[PDB]
Write a protein that binds this DNA or RNA. Structure first.
Ligand SMILES: [Mg+2]
Ligand SMILES: [Mg+2]
Ligand SMILES: [Mg+2]
Ligand SMILES: [Mg+2]
Ligand SMILES: [Mg+2]
Ligand SMILES: [Mg+2]
Ligand SMILES: [Mg+2]
Ligand SMILES: [Mg+2]
Ligand SMILES: [Mg+2]
Ligand SMILES: [Mg+2]
Ligand SMILES: [Mg+2]
Ligand SMILES: [Mg+2]
Ligand SMILES: [Mg+2]
Ligand SMILES: [Mg+2]
Ligand SMILES: [Mg+2]
Ligand SMILES: [Mg+2]
Ligand SMILES: [Mg+2]
Ligand SMILES: [Mg+2]
Ligand SMILES: [Mg+2]
Ligand SMILES: [Mg+2]
Ligand SMILES: [Mg+2]
Ligand SMILES: [Mg+2]
Ligand SMILES: [Mg+2]
Ligand SMILES: [Mg+2]
Ligand SMILES: [Mg+2]
Ligand SMILES: [Mg+2]
Ligand SMILES: [Mg+2]
Ligand SMILES: [Mg+2]
Ligand SMILES: [Mg+2]
Ligand SMILES: [Mg+2]
Ligand SMILES: [Mg+2]
Ligand SMILES: [Mg+2]
Ligand SMILES: [Mg+2]
Ligand SMILES: [Mg+2]
Ligand SMILES: [Mg+2]
Ligand SMILES: [Mg+2]
Ligand SMILES: [Mg+2]
Ligand SMILES: [Mg+2]
Ligand SMILES: [Mg+2]
Ligand SMILES: [Mg+2]
Ligand SMILES: [Mg+2]
Ligand SMILES: [Mg+2]
Ligand SMILES: [Mg+2]
Ligand SMILES: [Mg+2]
Ligand SMILES: [Mg+2]
Ligand SMILES: [Mg+2]
Ligand SMILES: [Mg+2]
Ligand SMILES: [Mg+2]
Ligand SMILES: [Mg+2]
Ligand SMILES: [Mg+2]
Ligand SMILES: [Mg+2]
Ligand SMILES: [Mg+2]
Ligand SMILES: [Zn+2]
Lengths: 357, 206, 60
RNA sequence: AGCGCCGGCCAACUCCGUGCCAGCAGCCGCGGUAAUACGGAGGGCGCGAGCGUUACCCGGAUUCACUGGGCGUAAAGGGC
RNA sequence: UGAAACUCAAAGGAAUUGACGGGGGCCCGCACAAGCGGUGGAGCAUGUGGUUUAAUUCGAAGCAACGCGAAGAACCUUACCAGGCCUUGACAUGCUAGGGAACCCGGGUGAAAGCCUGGGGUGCCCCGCGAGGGGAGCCCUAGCACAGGUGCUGCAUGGCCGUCGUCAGCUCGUGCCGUGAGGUGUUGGGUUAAGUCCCGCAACGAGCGCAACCCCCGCCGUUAGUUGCCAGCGGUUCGGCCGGGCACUCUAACGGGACUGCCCGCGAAAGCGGGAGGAAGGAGGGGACGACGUCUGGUCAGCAUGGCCCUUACGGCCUGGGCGACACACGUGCUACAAUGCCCACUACAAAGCGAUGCCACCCGGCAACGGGGAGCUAAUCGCAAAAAGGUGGGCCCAGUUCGGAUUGGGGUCUGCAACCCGACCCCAUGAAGCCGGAAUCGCUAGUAAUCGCGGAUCAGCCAUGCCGCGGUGAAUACG
RNA sequence: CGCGGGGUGGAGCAGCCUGGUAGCUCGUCGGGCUCAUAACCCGAAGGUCGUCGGUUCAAAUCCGGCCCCCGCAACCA
RNA sequence: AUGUAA
């Protein structure tokens, strides 16, 4: 089977030369070598950085796909020289330096996973109904259970966080915690609206019926609740209270105002007779105003998700699972697997790996 | 949907078997198989003739195939040329005394399987299926039959939506045993797919 | 896996157990009658056709 | 020698590609895998130094009805 | 008093045919009621959903999917998975190039498939004593065209089937009514299992259905008398055993018989009620038989077949594994929970079928499965075969038990190349749940339900408690 | 450290003061009725009693410390 | 009480 475990390294390298543009990097690496050779290249050492480390960023690409096309050809002659001589050491020595090139190739395939800051966080998966109706709430449930079987395969945690079962039959919404390694990297290329076309069991006269559902994936960042505030940027003002009180309100600076310098937020207090029973309050309320603003940043980011996703609607598919003629076209890339009821069982590798490009 | 085959329904009442002989537990299977091969070979080669019935008889170690056809000449050949040519091709497979006869089909337009292959042929010729069917039923009634019914099922005219067209005249009492009704089936292979044909001719209440 | 099998069922085996009836008309492996060499479907088709000698619709 | 068109209105039909996508559209409506309705091709129809489109006017509109319409239930008898 | 922007390709009026109504009237069907026995609870068998898995191949989805395609999955089957393999192929036809090719026999390697090989030897048919060239069915390696696919679409299809529904209906021809869709006939009154028939009628006829003609069971007759049967005599070693006879019973063909035919009563008739005769009476009991159409019903995995897809692979061979998994969930069944019962000994009465490495009488060995002898039988002669309930006698005495046989240990028999996964049977021991089952729910109106056994197809064997048949015993209840 | 009332299954609440049993409604899981859902019917699962420290043979319960929570109070200059 | 969307 070893001559078939080098044939899979020939396919994994061609797909690596296709998306990475083996020609637009063999060419770009040549223009960097033409500029850095001149000793008069250190004229603005900032420019030399983005070229000297870029040349090492293109020599980790061009030169690696050169030692994979030549290194595997030297193994196609080393495995037939140990069979026709009964030499059993030439055959331990043509696979050892073959599994090291399978790591040089597997490492360079992590130019698909190393494209997203932090692609190992125990991500979450949000499937929502919408479109189709009761048919799609069934469809959203089938798409729910499908990803569960997916995570069952590659080895993750499937903790459902939040559900909402459909009114008639099905699921309106689900949140799954995909706790694992490279978890966000895998499911990241699933963010979209999956389309289902089939005979609806819910339609009175059993017609052919389209129903949509979405899956949205985000990684895991933590609480990020309260933020520290040192008095080095707070400016506490003091003055006299206003209104009733008598003499002990005329000669007493009992009211306080705490103005935060970088934020620009002001806050006062004057309730109690003591300046520091008021300053206690003014720190309290001040914590509150910063907690509001730092909240408003995140809710603004929340609406950024809402306003950039959308919309579990018709002209909005990424993949189309049509069960009435047995096909699942991923109109993004796009594969055309005919095993509909095998993808619904969790064979999304056919799509994930091919759609990380 | 429902209706039972009208010939299989009258065997030994109004209708007679087409392979008539005896065989025991130990022999029956092998005789029947080659017998169908006899039916197999002849069904293709004798189509051009207008093959209607295939009666077959057997006596200890010898078998006689009596072929009904509308155009006997097309079967026998030139002065008896092919009828001999066939008997040898036949009894080659058979390996026994294969007396190969021919018999007249007095009025093919009262033979249901014949009427059926006509229309099946007609619609492979891209004819107006309704016209074919109306035509077919009219001759069969002209030729004196007390009743006739013809139906064709499939992509009629090539249409994507399959449909069934039939036409009938006089009586066709499929529930009555004592009514003699010939039945026949013909498969029409087209560019867009297969069409099915049923022909019912009511010869009489015998 | 059909024609290879409508064929292989004819061919002699490694052990006499591996032999099995296929319907000589359509190649069916199930409900093959020894007496006819036919499956229940072919048996019904021919019987109605009248091409089974002595065989008839049984009514009692 | 070019321009429009070839589902019905309305004259001119088949092959491939696409697969409620890309797109068409004056109205009815086409496209969710075998589309004479989308794109191309072949073929055809209509005009020809032009051919289409858009805007506007009259016509069809007898749909403001003098020619030449209506009002029980369709729009419409005033509460008397 | 009274706009507009915007927006829609309609909003509407009447009437037609259906469908529906928590509208009416008149009807029918184990639909209910009236009863009998169950399912749901237990244990197990089986199918399914899930989940599990390298794969646990696929289809079936309310009725009408779920002991269904599967009327026989250890390998085969097998369509899935893993690995070892094959490229003109396991199979069809037609070529091109170089060769003998037949056909039979072995070696090594290997889990097999396969791979690498060593041999005998095409007798064919044209010239000749002949060397010898020449025929070609047939093989080897190549190169071809091709084959091959249980891969997709039952929403492109044929065929076949399920279903409403054995329901009483669905239409046509001519005529008449309406601008028209359409109506009339087909409605109405009576009757029937029925659009069954009678009468009436702008209808008059006609077709597909209904009924009948077909099959089994009932009574009787004719023909026929062994391989079947003995009423009578003989012999009878008691076994129709032998003679002898074909009456019987029987067997299997052919007919007869039932048609509301006859009497009484109601009625216009059709028909309805009662009585006789009769084996049988109002359709005698059961079967076959399924209208135009419905469910864009089921089946491309029986087969056929358009289109689409795979060609060192989505083809093909093999070995092994899987289809038999198991936290659970549902359907269908088997065995039960006991005294109208269980067990033991003895002892009667069936039918329909099957039978040549088939059934296997009788004998011997073994507790037994079975093994070893060995008669008979192309089957009314021989065998499977004991029918079981029942009957007679005895034991048990209400106890999770002489109930109940699940589970498990051990020891075997047989089939088969091979019983680890994964066969059935026998024996010893083990002796679980289960004390009559929640909500809910099924079948059956007479030889029916209940209960009791027997046979067959499939099949080496068998996971059959399934299915298709067969007879034995034999109820309850139907006001409505 | 103002006074006094609380924190109990998923939600909302009883049970404390008289120490040994945690109960009610909804929800939830399984089964039914339905062509299907809701409603309805049968059956089930479910709680460190906010914590930390121990009193008592024994703490949801009695007594302190801390953590949040609701209500009241914060007056005379 | 309800049953969307070819
Ligand atoms: Mg929701
Ligand atoms: Mg349905
Ligand atoms: Mg004051
Ligand atoms: Mg002061
Ligand atoms: Mg077998
Ligand atoms: Mg034009
Ligand atoms: Mg035209
Ligand atoms: Mg096209
Ligand atoms: Mg065009
Ligand atoms: Mg156009
Ligand atoms: Mg105008
Ligand atoms: Mg005008
Ligand atoms: Mg006027
Ligand atoms: Mg007007
Ligand atoms: Mg009005
Ligand atoms: Mg008025
Ligand atoms: Mg008014
Ligand atoms: Mg007035
Ligand atoms: Mg307007
Ligand atoms: Mg109005
Ligand atoms: Mg109206
Ligand atoms: Mg009604
Ligand atoms: Mg009932
Ligand atoms: Mg009842
Ligand atoms: Mg049970
Ligand atoms: Mg399939
Ligand atoms: Mg079985
Ligand atoms: Mg195998
Ligand atoms: Mg269909
Ligand atoms: Mg069909
Ligand atoms: Mg299907
Ligand atoms: Mg008429
Ligand atoms: Mg009419
Ligand atoms: Mg009618
Ligand atoms: Mg009518
Ligand atoms: Mg009639
Ligand atoms: Mg008699
Ligand atoms: Mg009768
Ligand atoms: Mg009938
Ligand atoms: Mg369908
Ligand atoms: Mg196996
Ligand atoms: Mg007896
Ligand atoms: Mg005996
Ligand atoms: Mg017992
Ligand atoms: Mg008891
Ligand atoms: Mg009844
Ligand atoms: Mg058996
Ligand atoms: Mg049995
Ligand atoms: Mg306690
Ligand atoms: Mg429930
Ligand atoms: Mg405390
Ligand atoms: Mg609602
Ligand atoms: Zn068959």
């Amino acid at each position: 089977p070893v001559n078939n475990r080098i044939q899979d390294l020939t396919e994994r390298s061609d797909v690596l030369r296709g998306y990475l543009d083996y020609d637009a990097k063999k060419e770009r690496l040549e223009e960097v070598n033409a500029e850095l050779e001149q000793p008069d290249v250190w004229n603005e050492p900032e420019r030399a950085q983005a070229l000297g480390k870029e040349r090492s960023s293109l020599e980790a690409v061009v030169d690696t796909l050169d030692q994979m096309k030549q290194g595997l050809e030297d193994v196609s002659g080393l495995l037939e020289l140990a069979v026709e001589a009964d030499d059993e050491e030439t055959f331990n020595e043509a696979v050892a330096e073959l599994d090291a090139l399978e790591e040089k190739l597997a490492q360079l395939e992590f130019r698909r996973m190393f494209s997203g800051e932090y692609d190992s966080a125990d991500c979450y998966l949000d499937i929502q109904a919408g479109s189709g109706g009761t048919e799609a709430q069934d469809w959203a449930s089938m798409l729910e259970r499908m990803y569960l079987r997916w995570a069952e395969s590659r080895g993750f945690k499937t903790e459902i966080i939040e559900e909402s079962e459909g009114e008639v039959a099905g699921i309106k919404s689900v949140t799954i915690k995909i706790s694992g390694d490279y978890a966000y990297g895998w499911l990241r290329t699933e963010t979209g609206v999956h389309r289902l076309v089939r005979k609806s069991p819910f339609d009175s006269g059993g017609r052919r019926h389209t129903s949509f559902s979405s899956a949205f994936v985000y990684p895991e960042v933590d609480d990020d609740i309260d933020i520290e505030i040192n008095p080095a940027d707070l400016r506490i003002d003091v003055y006299r209270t206003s209104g009733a009180g008598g003499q002990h309100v005329n000669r007493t600076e009992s009211a306080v105002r705490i103005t935060h310098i970088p934020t620009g937020i002001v806050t006062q207090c004057q309730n109690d007779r003591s300046q520091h029973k008021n300053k206690d309050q003014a720190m309290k309320q001040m914590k509150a105003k910063l907690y509001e603003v730092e909240m408003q940043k995140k809710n603004a980011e929340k609406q950024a998700m809402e306003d950039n996703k959308s919309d579990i609607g018709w002209g909005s598919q990424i993949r189309s699972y049509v069960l009435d003629d047995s096909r699942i076209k991923d109109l993004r890339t796009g594969v055309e697997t005919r095993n509909t009821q095998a993808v619904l069982d969790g064979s999304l590798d056919q799509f994930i790996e091919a759609s990380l490009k | 949907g429902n209706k039972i085959h009208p010939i299989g329904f009258r065997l030994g009442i109004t209708r007679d078997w087409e392979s008539r002989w005896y065989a025991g537990k130990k022999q029956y299977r092998h005789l029947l198989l080659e017998d169908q091969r006899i039916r197999g070979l002849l069904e293709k080669e004798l189509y051009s003739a207008g093959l209607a019935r295939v009666d077959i008889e057997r006596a200890a170690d010898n078998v006689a195939v009596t072929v009904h056809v509308a155009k006997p000449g097309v079967v026998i050949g030139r002065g008896g040329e092919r009828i001999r040519v066939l008997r040898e091709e036949l009894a080659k497979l058979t390996g026994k005394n294969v007396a190969l006869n021919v018999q007249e089909v007095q009025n093919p337009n009262l033979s249901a399987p014949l009427v059926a292959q006509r229309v099946a042929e007609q619609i492979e010729r891209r004819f107006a299926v309704r016209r074919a069917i109306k035509q077919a039923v009219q001759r069969v009634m002209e030729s004196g039959a007390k009743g006739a019914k013809v139906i064709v099922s499939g992509r009629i005219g090539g249409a994507e939506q399959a449909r069934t067209e039939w036409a009938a005249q006089g009586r066709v009492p499929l529930h009555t045993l004592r009514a003699n009704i010939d039945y026949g089936f013909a498969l029409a292979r087209t560019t867009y797919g297969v069409l099915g044909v049923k022909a019912y001719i009511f010869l009489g209440e015998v | 896996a059909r024609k290879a099998l409508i064929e292989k069922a004819k061919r002699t085996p490694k052990f006499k157990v591996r032999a099995y009836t296929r319907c000589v008309r359509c190649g069916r492996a199930r409900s093959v009658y020894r007496f006819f060499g036919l499956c229940r479907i072919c048996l019904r088709e021919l019987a109605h056709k009248g091409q089974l000698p002595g065989v008839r619709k049984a009514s009692w």
